Amino acid sequence: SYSAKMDYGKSVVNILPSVEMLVNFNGDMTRSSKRSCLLYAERVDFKELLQLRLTEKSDQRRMYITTVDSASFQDLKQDQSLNVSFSGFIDNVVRMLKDCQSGKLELHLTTRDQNLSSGREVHDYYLQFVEIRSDKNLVHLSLPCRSAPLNTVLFYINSMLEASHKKQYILEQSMQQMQAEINAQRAHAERLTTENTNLREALAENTR
Amino acid sequence: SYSAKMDYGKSVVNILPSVEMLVNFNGDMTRSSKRSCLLYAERVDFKELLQLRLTEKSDQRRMYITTVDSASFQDLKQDQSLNVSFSGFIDNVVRMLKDCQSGKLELHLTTRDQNLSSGREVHDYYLQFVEIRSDKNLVHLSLPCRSAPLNTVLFYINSMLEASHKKQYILEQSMQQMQAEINAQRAHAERLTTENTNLREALAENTR
Protein backbone atom coordinates (compact mmCIF):
# COMPACT_ATOMS: atom_id res chain seq x y z
CA SER A 1 0.00 0.00 0.00
CA TYR A 2 0.95 3.67 -0.23
CA SER A 3 1.90 6.03 2.58
CA ALA A 4 3.82 9.23 2.98
CA LYS A 5 7.42 8.71 4.04
CA MET A 6 9.33 11.60 5.57
CA ASP A 7 12.34 10.94 3.32
CA TYR A 8 13.44 14.55 2.86
CA GLY A 9 16.90 14.37 4.37
CA LYS A 10 18.18 17.50 6.05
CA SER A 11 14.77 19.16 5.47
CA VAL A 12 13.24 16.91 8.12
CA VAL A 13 12.79 18.90 11.33
CA ASN A 14 11.98 17.27 14.69
CA ILE A 15 9.18 19.50 15.98
CA LEU A 16 9.38 17.65 19.30
CA PRO A 17 11.93 15.20 20.68
CA SER A 18 10.81 11.55 20.43
CA VAL A 19 9.16 10.52 23.69
CA GLU A 20 7.41 7.69 25.46
CA MET A 21 3.69 8.33 25.99
CA LEU A 22 0.80 6.38 27.51
CA VAL A 23 -1.87 6.30 24.78
CA ASN A 24 -5.51 5.30 24.92
CA PHE A 25 -6.71 2.73 22.40
CA ASN A 26 -10.35 3.29 21.37
CA GLY A 27 -13.63 4.74 22.64
CA ASP A 28 -15.72 2.57 24.99
CA MET A 29 -13.62 2.30 28.22
CA THR A 30 -14.90 -1.25 28.80
CA ARG A 31 -13.50 -2.32 25.38
CA SER A 32 -10.45 -0.03 25.31
CA SER A 33 -6.84 -0.29 26.45
CA LYS A 34 -3.96 1.93 27.61
CA ARG A 35 -0.59 1.13 26.02
CA SER A 36 2.95 2.54 26.16
CA CYS A 37 3.80 4.13 22.82
CA LEU A 38 6.63 6.13 21.27
CA LEU A 39 5.77 9.38 19.56
CA TYR A 40 7.74 10.90 16.71
CA ALA A 41 6.75 14.38 15.55
CA GLU A 42 8.41 15.91 12.48
CA ARG A 43 7.79 18.43 9.68
CA VAL A 44 9.36 19.52 6.37
CA ASP A 45 11.16 22.88 6.29
CA PHE A 46 10.48 23.88 2.67
CA LYS A 47 6.82 22.84 2.44
CA GLU A 48 3.76 22.58 4.69
CA LEU A 49 3.93 18.94 5.66
CA LEU A 50 3.51 17.42 9.10
CA GLN A 51 3.83 13.82 10.16
CA LEU A 52 3.11 12.23 13.52
CA ARG A 53 4.22 8.65 14.03
CA LEU A 54 2.99 6.50 16.87
CA THR A 55 4.64 3.15 17.62
CA GLU A 56 3.80 0.54 20.26
CA LYS A 57 6.89 0.35 22.47
CA SER A 58 6.70 -3.44 22.78
CA ASP A 59 6.53 -3.91 18.99
CA GLN A 60 7.50 -0.89 16.92
CA ARG A 61 6.17 -2.72 13.85
CA ARG A 62 2.76 -1.67 15.16
CA MET A 63 2.81 1.78 13.55
CA TYR A 64 0.11 4.43 13.15
CA ILE A 65 0.79 7.46 11.01
CA THR A 66 -0.90 10.84 10.69
CA THR A 67 0.16 13.01 7.76
CA VAL A 68 -1.31 16.47 7.23
CA ASP A 69 -0.29 18.77 4.37
CA SER A 70 -1.71 22.09 3.10
CA ALA A 71 -4.89 20.69 1.58
CA SER A 72 -5.51 18.36 4.53
CA PHE A 73 -4.96 21.28 6.83
CA GLN A 74 -7.56 23.31 4.99
CA ASP A 75 -10.06 20.49 5.45
CA LEU A 76 -9.22 20.30 9.15
CA LYS A 77 -9.46 24.05 9.50
CA GLN A 78 -12.95 24.09 8.00
CA ASP A 79 -14.33 20.98 9.70
CA GLN A 80 -13.04 21.78 13.20
CA SER A 81 -13.29 25.55 12.99
CA LEU A 82 -9.58 26.09 13.61
CA ASN A 83 -8.55 29.72 13.81
CA VAL A 84 -4.85 29.34 12.98
CA SER A 85 -2.30 29.16 10.16
CA PHE A 86 -0.25 26.05 9.37
CA SER A 87 2.61 27.30 11.55
CA GLY A 88 0.27 28.18 14.39
CA PHE A 89 -1.26 24.74 13.94
CA ILE A 90 2.17 23.15 14.37
CA ASP A 91 2.71 25.27 17.51
CA ASN A 92 -0.62 24.13 18.94
CA VAL A 93 0.09 20.49 18.13
CA VAL A 94 3.47 20.63 19.83
CA ARG A 95 2.00 22.37 22.87
CA MET A 96 -0.73 19.75 23.13
CA LEU A 97 1.75 16.85 22.81
CA LYS A 98 3.71 18.35 25.68
CA ASP A 99 0.45 18.63 27.69
CA CYS A 100 -0.16 14.94 26.96
CA GLN A 101 3.29 14.27 28.40
CA SER A 102 2.64 16.28 31.58
CA GLY A 103 -0.78 14.66 31.94
CA LYS A 104 -2.76 17.85 31.36
CA LEU A 105 -4.13 16.10 28.28
CA GLU A 106 -4.71 12.57 27.06
CA LEU A 107 -3.79 11.14 23.66
CA HIS A 108 -6.46 8.85 22.21
CA LEU A 109 -6.40 6.56 19.19
CA THR A 110 -10.02 5.98 18.23
CA THR A 111 -11.32 3.59 15.61
CA ARG A 112 -13.39 5.45 13.07
CA ASP A 113 -16.99 4.20 13.07
CA GLN A 114 -17.18 2.54 9.65
CA ASN A 115 -19.78 0.51 7.75
CA LEU A 116 -20.50 -0.84 4.25
CA SER A 117 -22.70 2.09 3.17
CA SER A 118 -20.27 4.87 4.18
CA GLY A 119 -18.03 3.76 1.30
CA ARG A 120 -14.30 3.49 1.98
CA GLU A 121 -11.56 5.75 3.36
CA VAL A 122 -7.77 5.51 3.71
CA HIS A 123 -7.68 6.58 7.36
CA ASP A 124 -9.19 4.03 9.77
CA TYR A 125 -8.37 5.91 12.99
CA TYR A 126 -8.47 9.30 14.72
CA LEU A 127 -5.62 10.69 16.76
CA GLN A 128 -7.39 12.79 19.38
CA PHE A 129 -6.24 15.24 22.02
CA VAL A 130 -8.75 14.87 24.86
CA GLU A 131 -9.16 17.04 28.00
CA ILE A 132 -10.70 15.13 30.90
CA ARG A 133 -13.31 17.30 32.58
CA SER A 134 -15.81 17.13 35.47
CA ASP A 135 -18.72 18.16 33.24
CA LYS A 136 -17.92 16.68 29.84
CA ASN A 137 -14.62 15.65 28.29
CA LEU A 138 -13.48 17.99 25.56
CA VAL A 139 -11.74 17.03 22.32
CA HIS A 140 -9.35 19.83 21.31
CA LEU A 141 -8.10 18.26 18.06
CA SER A 142 -9.04 15.21 16.00
CA LEU A 143 -6.53 14.15 13.24
CA PRO A 144 -7.17 11.48 10.55
CA CYS A 145 -4.83 8.62 11.46
CA ARG A 146 -3.78 5.63 9.38
CA SER A 147 -2.45 2.14 9.98
CA ALA A 148 1.00 2.26 8.36
CA PRO A 149 1.51 -0.12 5.39
CA LEU A 150 4.43 -2.57 5.40
CA ASN A 151 6.64 -0.67 3.01
CA THR A 152 6.54 2.49 5.12
CA VAL A 153 6.98 0.63 8.39
CA LEU A 154 9.97 -1.22 7.00
CA PHE A 155 11.39 2.13 5.92
CA TYR A 156 11.19 3.64 9.41
CA ILE A 157 12.35 0.55 11.30
CA ASN A 158 15.26 0.09 8.87
CA SER A 159 16.21 3.73 9.28
CA MET A 160 16.03 3.39 13.03
CA LEU A 161 18.30 0.34 12.81
CA GLU A 162 20.86 2.25 10.76
CA ALA A 163 20.76 5.19 13.16
CA SER A 164 21.24 2.80 16.05
CA HIS A 165 24.28 1.29 14.40
CA LYS A 166 25.82 4.70 13.73
CA LYS A 167 25.16 5.66 17.35
CA GLN A 168 26.81 2.43 18.54
CA TYR A 169 29.81 3.24 16.35
CA ILE A 170 30.07 6.77 17.75
CA LEU A 171 29.77 5.36 21.30
CA GLU A 172 32.39 2.65 20.82
CA GLN A 173 34.80 5.04 19.10
CA SER A 174 34.21 7.64 21.83
CA MET A 175 35.19 4.78 24.09
CA GLN A 176 38.19 3.83 21.92
CA GLN A 177 39.93 7.22 22.02
CA MET A 178 39.19 7.22 25.77
CA GLN A 179 40.26 3.57 26.25
CA ALA A 180 43.92 4.65 26.10
CA GLU A 181 43.44 6.49 29.39
CA ILE A 182 42.48 3.32 31.27
CA ASN A 183 45.64 1.53 30.08
CA ALA A 184 48.01 4.49 30.46
CA GLN A 185 46.95 6.22 33.67
CA ARG A 186 46.65 3.16 35.90
CA ALA A 187 49.93 1.86 34.48
CA HIS A 188 51.43 5.22 35.38
CA ALA A 189 49.77 4.91 38.82
CA GLU A 190 50.04 1.40 40.32
CA ARG A 191 53.47 0.60 38.85
CA LEU A 192 55.32 3.92 39.18
CA THR A 193 54.10 4.91 42.68
CA THR A 194 56.32 2.18 44.15
CA GLU A 195 59.18 4.70 43.84
CA ASN A 196 57.37 6.50 46.65
CA THR A 197 56.97 3.43 48.86
CA ASN A 198 60.75 2.93 48.58
CA LEU A 199 61.67 6.63 48.93
CA ARG A 200 60.49 6.74 52.54
CA GLU A 201 63.02 4.02 53.41
CA ALA A 202 65.68 6.15 51.72
CA LEU A 203 64.48 9.02 53.90
CA ALA A 204 64.61 6.70 56.93
CA GLU A 205 68.40 6.30 56.95
CA ASN A 206 68.90 10.08 56.97
CA THR A 207 66.01 10.97 59.32
CA ARG A 208 67.92 11.19 62.62
CA SER B 1 3.63 -13.23 1.27
CA TYR B 2 5.02 -16.22 3.20
CA SER B 3 8.55 -17.21 4.17
CA ALA B 4 10.14 -19.27 6.89
CA LYS B 5 11.11 -17.21 9.93
CA MET B 6 13.63 -18.54 12.45
CA ASP B 7 11.35 -17.64 15.36
CA TYR B 8 12.18 -20.69 17.48
CA GLY B 9 13.52 -18.92 20.55
CA LYS B 10 16.40 -20.55 22.40
CA SER B 11 16.33 -23.39 19.85
CA VAL B 12 17.95 -21.05 17.32
CA VAL B 13 21.69 -21.78 17.11
CA ASN B 14 24.23 -19.55 15.32
CA ILE B 15 26.15 -22.11 13.29
CA LEU B 16 28.51 -19.29 12.33
CA PRO B 17 29.00 -15.78 13.71
CA SER B 18 27.41 -13.04 11.55
CA VAL B 19 30.06 -11.71 9.18
CA GLU B 20 30.72 -9.30 6.33
CA MET B 21 31.32 -11.06 3.01
CA LEU B 22 31.98 -9.90 -0.54
CA VAL B 23 29.35 -11.65 -2.73
CA ASN B 24 28.97 -11.96 -6.51
CA PHE B 25 25.63 -10.98 -7.98
CA ASN B 26 24.81 -13.13 -11.05
CA GLY B 27 26.46 -15.06 -13.91
CA ASP B 28 27.81 -13.16 -16.96
CA MET B 29 30.67 -10.96 -15.65
CA THR B 30 29.77 -8.23 -18.14
CA ARG B 31 26.34 -7.97 -16.43
CA SER B 32 27.26 -8.99 -12.87
CA SER B 33 28.42 -7.11 -9.76
CA LYS B 34 30.34 -7.59 -6.51
CA ARG B 35 28.69 -6.27 -3.37
CA SER B 36 29.46 -6.21 0.37
CA CYS B 37 26.91 -8.34 2.20
CA LEU B 38 26.25 -9.60 5.71
CA LEU B 39 25.75 -13.32 6.18
CA TYR B 40 23.68 -14.89 8.95
CA ALA B 41 23.87 -18.66 9.41
CA GLU B 42 21.59 -20.42 11.88
CA ARG B 43 19.88 -23.77 12.59
CA VAL B 44 17.21 -25.25 14.88
CA ASP B 45 18.40 -27.65 17.57
CA PHE B 46 15.27 -29.85 17.88
CA LYS B 47 14.60 -30.27 14.15
CA GLU B 48 16.58 -30.35 10.90
CA LEU B 49 16.19 -26.79 9.70
CA LEU B 50 18.90 -24.51 8.32
CA GLN B 51 18.59 -20.89 7.25
CA LEU B 52 21.18 -18.69 5.58
CA ARG B 53 20.29 -15.00 5.35
CA LEU B 54 22.14 -12.62 3.09
CA THR B 55 21.65 -8.86 3.42
CA GLU B 56 23.25 -6.07 1.41
CA LYS B 57 25.35 -4.03 3.85
CA SER B 58 24.24 -0.69 2.38
CA ASP B 59 20.53 -1.62 2.71
CA GLN B 60 19.64 -4.63 4.87
CA ARG B 61 16.06 -4.45 3.51
CA ARG B 62 17.58 -6.21 0.47
CA MET B 63 17.37 -9.72 1.92
CA TYR B 64 17.86 -13.11 0.28
CA ILE B 65 16.96 -16.19 2.26
CA THR B 66 17.88 -19.86 1.82
CA THR B 67 15.91 -22.30 3.97
CA VAL B 68 16.64 -26.02 3.94
CA ASP B 69 14.67 -28.63 5.89
CA SER B 70 14.65 -32.45 5.80
CA ALA B 71 12.68 -32.87 2.57
CA SER B 72 14.57 -30.09 0.86
CA PHE B 73 17.80 -31.70 2.00
CA GLN B 74 16.78 -35.00 0.47
CA ASP B 75 16.11 -33.23 -2.82
CA LEU B 76 19.55 -31.60 -2.76
CA LYS B 77 21.19 -34.87 -1.77
CA GLN B 78 19.68 -36.62 -4.78
CA ASP B 79 20.15 -33.84 -7.33
CA GLN B 80 23.74 -32.97 -6.39
CA SER B 81 24.91 -36.45 -5.42
CA LEU B 82 25.81 -35.37 -1.89
CA ASN B 83 27.30 -38.11 0.25
CA VAL B 84 26.47 -36.70 3.69
CA SER B 85 23.87 -36.56 6.45
CA PHE B 86 22.09 -33.37 7.53
CA SER B 87 24.64 -32.71 10.30
CA GLY B 88 27.54 -33.38 7.96
CA PHE B 89 25.83 -31.04 5.50
CA ILE B 90 25.73 -28.30 8.17
CA ASP B 91 29.47 -28.96 8.83
CA ASN B 92 30.28 -28.68 5.12
CA VAL B 93 28.28 -25.45 4.70
CA VAL B 94 29.95 -23.85 7.71
CA ARG B 95 33.38 -24.93 6.44
CA MET B 96 32.67 -23.54 2.99
CA LEU B 97 31.40 -20.23 4.41
CA LYS B 98 34.63 -19.88 6.33
CA ASP B 99 36.51 -20.61 3.08
CA CYS B 100 34.52 -17.84 1.38
CA GLN B 101 35.71 -15.57 4.14
CA SER B 102 39.36 -16.57 3.69
CA GLY B 103 39.09 -16.23 -0.08
CA LYS B 104 39.60 -19.93 -0.74
CA LEU B 105 36.06 -19.89 -2.14
CA GLU B 106 33.63 -17.41 -3.70
CA LEU B 107 29.98 -16.92 -2.83
CA HIS B 108 27.63 -16.31 -5.76
CA LEU B 109 23.99 -15.27 -5.89
CA THR B 110 22.89 -16.40 -9.35
CA THR B 111 19.55 -15.68 -11.01
CA ARG B 112 17.74 -18.87 -11.95
CA ASP B 113 17.19 -18.96 -15.73
CA GLN B 114 13.39 -18.80 -16.05
CA ASN B 115 10.90 -18.40 -18.89
CA LEU B 116 7.11 -18.56 -19.41
CA SER B 117 7.02 -22.23 -20.44
CA SER B 118 9.06 -23.54 -17.49
CA GLY B 119 7.52 -24.62 -14.19
CA ARG B 120 6.90 -21.67 -11.90
CA GLU B 121 9.02 -21.50 -8.74
CA VAL B 122 9.20 -19.60 -5.46
CA HIS B 123 13.01 -19.54 -5.42
CA ASP B 124 14.34 -17.19 -8.09
CA TYR B 125 18.03 -17.40 -7.14
CA TYR B 126 20.82 -19.88 -6.35
CA LEU B 127 23.29 -19.41 -3.56
CA GLN B 128 26.44 -21.00 -4.97
CA PHE B 129 29.81 -21.89 -3.51
CA VAL B 130 32.29 -21.54 -6.37
CA GLU B 131 35.95 -22.64 -6.46
CA ILE B 132 38.00 -20.54 -8.91
CA ARG B 133 40.32 -22.82 -10.86
CA SER B 134 42.87 -22.64 -13.72
CA ASP B 135 41.13 -25.33 -15.79
CA LYS B 136 37.44 -24.82 -15.05
CA ASN B 137 35.68 -23.19 -12.12
CA LEU B 138 33.93 -25.74 -9.93
CA VAL B 139 30.59 -25.31 -8.10
CA HIS B 140 30.72 -27.27 -4.84
CA LEU B 141 27.18 -26.52 -3.68
CA SER B 142 24.12 -24.89 -5.23
CA LEU B 143 21.24 -23.93 -2.84
CA PRO B 144 17.76 -22.69 -3.83
CA CYS B 145 17.65 -19.08 -2.65
CA ARG B 146 14.60 -16.83 -2.31
CA SER B 147 14.04 -13.09 -2.33
CA ALA B 148 12.71 -12.40 1.16
CA PRO B 149 9.11 -11.08 1.33
CA LEU B 150 8.31 -7.90 3.27
CA ASN B 151 6.80 -9.58 6.26
CA THR B 152 9.92 -11.61 6.93
CA VAL B 153 12.31 -8.77 6.25
CA LEU B 154 10.37 -6.57 8.67
CA PHE B 155 10.56 -9.34 11.26
CA TYR B 156 14.35 -9.60 11.06
CA ILE B 157 15.07 -5.88 10.82
CA ASN B 158 12.73 -5.20 13.75
CA SER B 159 14.50 -7.94 15.74
CA MET B 160 17.87 -6.50 14.88
CA LEU B 161 16.71 -3.08 16.02
CA GLU B 162 15.53 -4.41 19.38
CA ALA B 163 18.81 -6.23 19.92
CA SER B 164 20.64 -3.05 18.97
CA HIS B 165 18.71 -1.10 21.59
CA LYS B 166 19.53 -3.65 24.28
CA LYS B 167 23.19 -3.42 23.27
CA GLN B 168 23.15 0.40 23.42
CA TYR B 169 21.62 0.48 26.88
CA ILE B 170 24.07 -2.11 28.23
CA LEU B 171 27.01 -0.30 26.62
CA GLU B 172 26.31 3.26 27.80
CA GLN B 173 25.23 2.11 31.25
CA SER B 174 28.48 0.18 31.64
CA MET B 175 30.38 3.17 30.19
CA GLN B 176 29.11 6.18 32.19
CA GLN B 177 30.26 4.94 35.61
CA MET B 178 33.75 4.46 34.21
CA GLN B 179 33.59 7.90 32.62
CA ALA B 180 33.08 9.23 36.15
CA GLU B 181 35.53 6.70 37.60
CA ILE B 182 38.36 7.94 35.39
CA ASN B 183 37.55 11.46 36.64
CA ALA B 184 37.68 10.41 40.28
CA GLN B 185 40.67 8.05 39.91
CA ARG B 186 42.80 10.27 37.62
CA ALA B 187 43.20 12.69 40.55
CA HIS B 188 45.39 9.95 42.02
CA ALA B 189 48.27 12.01 40.59
CA GLU B 190 47.38 15.26 42.37
CA ARG B 191 46.45 13.07 45.43
CA LEU B 192 49.76 11.19 45.62
CA THR B 193 52.09 13.80 44.12
CA THR B 194 51.89 15.86 47.30
CA GLU B 195 53.43 12.77 48.90
CA ASN B 196 55.90 12.66 46.02
CA THR B 197 56.84 16.23 45.07
CA ASN B 198 57.51 17.35 48.64
CA LEU B 199 59.27 14.12 49.57
CA ARG B 200 61.67 14.48 46.63
CA GLU B 201 62.50 17.89 48.10
CA ALA B 202 62.79 16.40 51.59
CA LEU B 203 65.24 13.83 50.21
CA ALA B 204 67.05 16.58 48.32
CA GLU B 205 67.26 18.66 51.52
CA ASN B 206 68.51 15.91 53.85
CA THR B 207 71.56 15.06 51.74
CA ARG B 208 72.12 18.62 50.47
Author numbering:
A (entry chain A), B (entry chain B): 9 to 216
What does the paper behind this entry write?
Centrioles are complex microtubule (MT) based structures that are required for the formation of centrosomes and cilia/flagella. The protein kinase recruits STIL/Ana2/SAS-5 and Sas-6 to a single site on the side of the mother centriole where they assemble with CPAP/Sas-4 into a cartwheel structure that helps to establish the ninefold symmetry of the centriole. Here we show that Ana2/STIL proteins also homo-oligomerise and that mutations that perturb the homo-oligomerisation of fly Ana2 in vitro also strongly perturb centriole assembly in vivo. Thus, Sas-6 homo-oligomerisation alone appears unable to drive efficient cartwheel assembly in vivo if Ana2 is unable to homo-oligomerise.
In initial attempts to purify Sas-61–241 the protein invariably formed large aggregates (blue trace) that appeared to be elongated chains of protein by negative-stain EM. It has previously been shown that a large hydrophobic residue in the headgroup is essential for the N–N interaction in several species, so we mutated the equivalent residue, F143, to Asp. Purified Sas-61–241-F143D behaved as a dimer by SEC-MALS (red trace) and aggregates were no longer detectable by negative-stain EM; we conclude that aggregate formation is dependent upon the N–N interaction, and the F143D mutation perturbs this interaction in vitro. To investigate how Drosophila Sas-6 might oligomerise into a cartwheel we solved the crystal structure of Sas-61–216-F143D to 2.9 Å. The asymmetric unit contained a dimer of Sas-6, associated via the coiled-coil interface. The DmSas-6 N-CC dimer could be superimposed with Sas-6 N-CC dimers from D. rerio, Chlamydomonas and Leishmania Sas-6 (average pairwise RMSD 1.87 ± 0.31 Å over 617 ± 47 backbone atom pairs). However it could not be superimposed onto C. elegans SAS-6, which has an alternative head-group-spoke conformation. Furthermore, we found that the DmSas-6 N-CC dimer could be modelled into a flat ninefold ring, similar to that observed in crystallo for Leishmania Sas-6. We also examined the structure of Drosophila Sas-6 and confirmed that, similar to other Sas-6 orthologues, it associates via two self-interaction interfaces, a C-terminal coiled-coil dimerization (C–C), and an N-terminal headgroup oligomerization (N–N). The interface between the headgroup and the C–C was similar to that seen in most other species, and different to that observed in C. elegans strongly suggesting that Drosophila Sas-6 assembles into a canonical, flat ring structure. In agreement with previous studies, we found that mutations that perturb the ability of Drosophila Sas-6 to homo-oligomerise through the N–N interface in vitro (GFP-Sas-6-F143D) cannot support efficient centriole duplication in vivo, and this is also true for mutations that perturb the ability of Ana2 to tetramerise in vitro (Ana2-CCA-GFP).
